[PDB]
């Protein structure tokens, strides 16, 4: 499923990502745009053999099992295929585990590069939330 910006903002709010662990809603919409262009089925293979999955490009070396990744750790205890659903439930749940570490949203390169230090709330303006 490919989300619109405000459609995803509304879905992320329903999934409890407004103000989760100190991060406002816009952070998550901004992250999704630059990671996956709002596409739940996005995949990206890395040189190291790991793959990024879903709307937030969550990596198989650390977070999910894809059966293909060398020193994979499966911290979210989920098949990576679950992160591809049009239902964003699993991506959100795994994102919340990731962000509950002291690294916070710094786990996502696209977020550090494109979102951190910007007016993130701009990502949720114009939306009937």
């Amino acid at each position, epitope marked *: 499923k490919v989300f619109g910006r405000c459609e995803l903002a509304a879905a992320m709010k329903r999934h409890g990502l407004d103000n989760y662990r100190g991060y406002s809603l816009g952070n998550w919409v901004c992250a999704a745009k630059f990671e996956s262009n709002f596409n739940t089925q996005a995949t990206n293979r890395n040189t190291d053999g790991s793959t990024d999955y879903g709307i937030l490009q969550i990596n198989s070396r*650390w977070w999910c099992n894809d059966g293909r990744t060398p020193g994979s750790r499966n911290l979210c205890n989920i098949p990576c295929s679950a992160l591809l659903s049009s239902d964003i439930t699993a991506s959100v749940n795994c994102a919340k585990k990731i962000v509950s570490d002291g690294n916070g949203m710094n786990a996502w390169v696209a977020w550090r590069n494109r979102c951190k230090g910007t007016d993130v709330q701009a990502w949720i303006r114009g939306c009937r939330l």
Partner: single-chain antibody, 220 residues
Framework: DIVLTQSPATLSVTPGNSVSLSCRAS??????LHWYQQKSHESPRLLIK???QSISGIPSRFSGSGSGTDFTLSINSVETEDFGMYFCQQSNSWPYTFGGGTKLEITDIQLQESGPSLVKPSQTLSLTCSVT????????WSWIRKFPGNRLEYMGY???????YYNPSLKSRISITRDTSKNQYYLDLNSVTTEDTATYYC???????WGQGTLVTVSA
């Protein structure tokens, strides 16, 4: 801190009847409200996560609803096995906090706590959790305690970077550490008082795997 208020405090019900347990929050927490069942001194069992999401192996009769500040656990036709305490827990904001509980009256990986059963005021309490079945580097790890009047307190957790989160109520007396080579992680609580008399639990941060709990009594 987020205060979670549960009502009713106690409920009596006949099997086959349905019940609704309410949890309200002092501030908005989105969908970040989880439900536990706890039976007279065993570890809590996670029933519903994120307000409405089903947990594998949990019976169909349990369902959750709500959002923001208002939440409900529903039991669609209660069975005798459903007796126990029911606790809500929020995960929106550190520190995680539990509701006060509702007494319902009806008319792979393993964790093992070890430590002293009796400690003296002002000594250090040291606990070990031994993890079987997976490496400790593959999850986040928590400590939780239950005070004698059924009150639950989330003490802390350590995550993948080694960053720790401690309940501020513990005022810097707590330390959580790991030993990868031993597959153990630890709780140290300094300068204990009789206020630290509790049953202590280790658990993974996900709330799926719990130790059995260990009662520690602080006495002169």
């Amino acid at each position: 801190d987020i205060v979670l208020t549960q009502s009713p405090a106690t409920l009596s019900v006949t099997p086959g009847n349905s019940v609704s347990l309410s949890c309200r929050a002092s501030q908005s927490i989105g969908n970040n409200l989880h439900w536990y069942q706890q039976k007279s001194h065993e570890s809590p069992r996670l029933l519903i996560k994120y307000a409405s999401q089903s947990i594998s192996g949990i019976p169909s009769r349990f369902s959750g609803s709500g959002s923001g500040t208002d939440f409900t656990l529903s039991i669609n036709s209660v069975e005798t096995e459903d007796f126990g305490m029911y606790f809500c827990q929020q995960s929106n904001s550190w520190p995680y906090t539990f509701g006060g509980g509702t007494k319902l009256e009806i008319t792979d990986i393993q964790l093992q706590e070890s430590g002293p059963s009796l400690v003296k005021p002002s000594q250090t309490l040291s606990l070990t959790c031994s993890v079987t079945g997976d490496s400790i580097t593959s999850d986040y790890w928590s400590w939780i305690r239950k005070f004698p009047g059924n009150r639950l307190e989330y003490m802390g957790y350590v995550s993948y970077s080694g960053s720790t989160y401690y309940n501020p109520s513990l005022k810097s007396r707590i330390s959580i550490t790991r030993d990868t080579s031993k597959n153990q992680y630890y709780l140290d609580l300094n300068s204990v008082t009789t206020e630290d008399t509790a049953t202590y639990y280790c658990a993974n941060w996900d709330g799926d795997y719990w130790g059995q709990g260990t009662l520690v009594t602080v006495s002169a």
